[PDB]
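Why run this: before we spend reagent on co-expression, it is cheaper to look at a predicted model of the complex and decide which construct boundaries make sense. The entries below are exactly what would go into the expression plan.
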Amino acid sequence: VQLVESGGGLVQPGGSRKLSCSASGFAFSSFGMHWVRQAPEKGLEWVAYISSGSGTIYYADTVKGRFTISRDDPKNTLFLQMTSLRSEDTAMYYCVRSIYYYGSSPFDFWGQGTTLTVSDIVMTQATSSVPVTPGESVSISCRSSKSLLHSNGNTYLYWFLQRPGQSPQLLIYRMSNLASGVPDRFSGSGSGTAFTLTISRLEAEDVGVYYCMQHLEYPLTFGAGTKLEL
Amino acid sequence: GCTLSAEDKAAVERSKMIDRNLREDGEKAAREVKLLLLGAGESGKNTIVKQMKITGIVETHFTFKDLHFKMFDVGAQRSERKKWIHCFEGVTAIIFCVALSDYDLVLAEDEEMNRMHASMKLFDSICNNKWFTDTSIILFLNKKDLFEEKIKKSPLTICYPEYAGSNTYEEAAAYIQCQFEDLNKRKDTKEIYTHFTCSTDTKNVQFVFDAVTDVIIKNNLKDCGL
Amino acid sequence: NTASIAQARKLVEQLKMEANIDRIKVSKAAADLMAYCEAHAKEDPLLTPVPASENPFR
Amino acid sequence: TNFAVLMAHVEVKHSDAVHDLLLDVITWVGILLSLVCLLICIFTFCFFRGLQSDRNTIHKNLCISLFVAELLFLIGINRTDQPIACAVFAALLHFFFLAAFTWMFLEGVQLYIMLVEVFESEHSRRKYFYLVGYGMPALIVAVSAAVDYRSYGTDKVCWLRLDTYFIWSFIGPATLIIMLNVIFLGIALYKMFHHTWVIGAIALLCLLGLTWAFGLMYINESTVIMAYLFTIFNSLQGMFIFIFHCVLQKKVRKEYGKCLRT
Amino acid sequence: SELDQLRQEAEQLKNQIRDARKACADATLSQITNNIDPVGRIQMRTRRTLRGHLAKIYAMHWGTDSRLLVSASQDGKLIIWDSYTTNKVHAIPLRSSWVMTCAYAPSGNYVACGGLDNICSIYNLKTREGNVRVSRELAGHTGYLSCCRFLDDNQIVTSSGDTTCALWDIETGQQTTTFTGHTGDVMSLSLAPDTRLFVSGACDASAKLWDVREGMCRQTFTGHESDINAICFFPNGNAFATGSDDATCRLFDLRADQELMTYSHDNIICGITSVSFSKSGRLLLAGYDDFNCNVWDALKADRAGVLAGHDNRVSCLGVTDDGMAVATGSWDSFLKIWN
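The model came back. Tokens follow.
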């Protein structure tokens, strides 16, 4: 499993450019794909979503008419096309896979991303920084502007981490479950619009930024993310 | 889907696309021609498969005259036949291979019970079973050369103590052919072909091709009245 | 020969293993079955079906 | 007013007897002998899931067209008083009867593709059947309406008009479809005699209802017998095809007994 | 000398076993539970109907979470369904089309397929690269495989038509225990909810009970007039049920060694292709050749609810872990769910 992205750079407002993602190590055509972006100094925000069979496409609010997503199955490749840019659109981009069937764990693996430079329900994050010590227990919390419990028992909240110089890595999907390659000290829970994540026995390479996300209904919305620094 | 979650839509999409693939596969899996092969041991089944160029079940496939033929050779099994044959009721035809030379050799302690007795018992068991009251049967007859070179020096009545004919090849061949083709109990539905093999018989599968064509016409010319 | 002796020995071993068994009465088994069915009855949906609010197939 | 008006080009249709009563009564009572068995027919050719093939499709579609054209004839005969309303009836009757002919021709083709094209086709061909069957009548009625409009609605019973050569929009196909159904039955009966009885050909006679030819020959009087044949055969076509393709076959009987009573 | 003594000992042991079997059967179940109120009629009805199969259905098995299914057919397909929304979860192609059994691991990780090619193939679900791939092809049998079941992620039980049974380890590939002692072809085996015992039936009017780690057969079971096609196991582990081909289903005990109950009706002169129990053990569910499934009172054998709706023979049926639904798979390509 390897997702290598290319095509970023620095452009002046207007113009056009195409960001490509090359997949290697997995069945390309059973997964749906997303594109997300991160601010040069702040959090994350959803951009676009394409699905299996080129049937459905969703965009966000500030993107229509400008962006075009597509997939080329035989060469196992994903394309985003961008035109008429502005200085508000400088960020860095990530291509994420997800497969929807009963029991699945979407947003499983994230790419490295590429830098691009140019010359409703909302998430509230409680804090911007909390000091820590190697050996005490810590908690973080965020809140959603509307309830996220659907009618089928699902509670669409996703908890993500980002360590320095790295790419994001899944930690919790649907409010209660652990992703792959994560120790069982991590935990999380929630209620009616108040959601909490718990880490016990802190360690090194466990300091950085934390984010929470919803997926009850498009478009997808992030928050500001808290920080544990040591 | 106004009442669907944001993620059940992809579930429905997945299920629909798998249904499309199943339907296409099961539509393309009804155009190849089935055949079920049988014959007693050492009766030339190896010769039959070798001439025409085609453990448990052993399947084999070949392509001729724009048709893909699929022969199920099932001689490697020694289990009871009441269980693994009813899954074979959809086949066009049953190939049955036997040899005319083994008219004397004894396969057991009973000298009267030669190999032909076992072959005809198998034939009678196959014809008069439930799952094949609409199935054409193709009878390959083998080993004519050794048959002539044997009957030049040995009689026939050793296994037929009611025969009253000439001891040359032609009368023996006609007698054996009628003796095989006279066990059918319903000639209003089934039919029994016969063809005499030879080492250069490149027409070894042309006979099967013709029999299958005629079977299909019989079906299409009966399901529409006429 | 030795095939008959081997078959007889195998049959003897099998019958000796089958004979020396502390068998129980069928009435006790039947009582166990009926007790398990009764003491677990109120959890079986396909005997007293679930109201459509909690029944997940409806 | 009788059934023969659909196709009789009898420009000098006259009489000196009780003709009209007998002819028209045969027409009406024959239609009323239909519209009863055809309903149960269209029910069976639409309900039993285990019968769905190409032939069942064609039978069902031609039967529904037959029924709707029958009832449209039974209702819209006596609407000649409205000067600007029975042209609509003429157009609708034209379209429905021509659809019936095209589905019968497709029935013949299907017979061919069973008794010569022995094996299964490479791909399903339902779309072509629907397209041709409901597109030939549509194109023909559209062109006929484009060429002229008055021809719809007559002086006695509103249908196509015999005073000018426009009846050639219904006579034409009535020739070019029988001319091929005869060939198709010839081939099928040829293979019934060479690659391998009479009741089967009689049954195939009621779908490809060749009996319509009993209308094309009514030159003038001293041909009342052939018009009697026209009425007595054609007005019972639905009931005849019911007998020949709903009860006589043991397959449909067994399927109906198994599934309908469930 | 030795042969005569062995024959005499075998005859004496057989006489003792017959005497014990005769003495143990003091009374039948139907004579004891005459005071138990009937379940009445069970007007079960269809809730869903799964489509997409084309040839007959040979096998279906539930999962541990009471939600997903698996089923195998002639066309070459092994399909994992979502019962609630009647959706595909997985589709699996095969190489041998003549399958006769299915297995589905209690951890939701592995499935198994087997049949008329002598090999038991094991498939891994929870992969990473996104396809249910092939891991192990257990070989070592000489006849068609009848049924296979999982013990845990690394232990499996198989039976074929050679009078043999096998306990196998996936990791190494080498057979660990062979069970012999049958005369005719073996058609089925059920597990136990402790993975220490199992029972099999053979095409010789007999069924035997075996220990799982020792390698021996501890019990033998007789009483039928012809071969046994399907067998399953009572959840508490003190009885089991078998289905013959002489129009009679039977309930034995793994501790009393005697024919205990029989189910058969005069109007039924066909075979029993599959038998299953339910969660509480109060219904016996039987698939017949008269094209419809019956629902016997599994403790009085005096009545039967009926499930119809198939145009052909019934070949398999299953019951959920929690007891919520029952599923029937038949020869008409349709698989149905009752609640």
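Chain C has one domain: 1-58. Residues 3-19 of chain C form the longest helix (17 residues). Bring this page to Monday's planning discussion.
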